[PDB]
Every structure is written in C-alpha cells, then in structure tokens.
Design brief:
The chain contains five helices and two strands; from the N terminus they run ααβααβα. By secondary structure, it is mainly alpha-helical. It has one domain. Strands 1-2 form a two-stranded antiparallel sheet. The chain is globular, with a radius of gyration of 12 Å. It binds calcium ion (3 copies). The site of one calcium ion (CA) has 2 residues, from helix 2. The PDB classes it as contractile protein.
C-alpha cells in the first residue's frame, strides 16, 4: 500500500483496524465487492462513532481518493475524522 496512507494507518491499533474492518464489511457484498459508495461512507463512519459533515465527506473524497471508497481509503478518512473531535 501507498506510504502516505501508511502515515495515516500507523496511527491505528490492531483492535481498531479489526473493529473498522468489521464495520466496513457490513456495507459490501464480501464475495464480490471491494468498495462502498460515497453515501455509505458517512454511514460507516457514524457506525464507528464519527460525525462527518457532508462538506467534509466531499473534501475527503476529493483529497484522499486514489464515487467509491475501498478499505484503505476508508481507514485514512477515519483517521482524519478521528482528529476533529472536540
Ligand atoms: Ca476497541
Ligand atoms: Ca474488539
Ligand atoms: Ca466490537
């Protein structure tokens, strides 16, 4: 994987990566799909307790995407969003 994403992903513990993967998997047909849609991305993030704004989701999609989000792109968006807690 990409090494920048590697700068985001190193922030996560193994418990975190596994918890996030179980949540992401709810939103794909495991047997046939690697990506969630941009509408599902807000849903998965909220399922992990994040509350991104729609303007945020668009920005993140613009900046992170290498319409759709695979697991490593999702991890980077999670890491980004986890840092805007107050
Ligand atoms: Ca945990
Ligand atoms: Ca656990
Ligand atoms: Ca759990």
């Amino acid at each position: 994987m990409n090494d920048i994403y590697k700068a985001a992903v190193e922030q996560l513990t193994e418990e975190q990566k596994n918890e996030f993967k179980a949540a992401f998997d709810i939103f794909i047909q495991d047997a046939e799909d690697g990506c969630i849609s941009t509408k599902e991305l807000g849903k998965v993030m909220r399922m992990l307790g994040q509350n991104p704004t729609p303007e945020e989701l668009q920005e993140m999609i613009d900046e992170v995407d290498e319409g759709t989000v695979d697991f490593d792109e999702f991890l980077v968006m999670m890491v980004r969003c986890m840092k805007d807690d107050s």
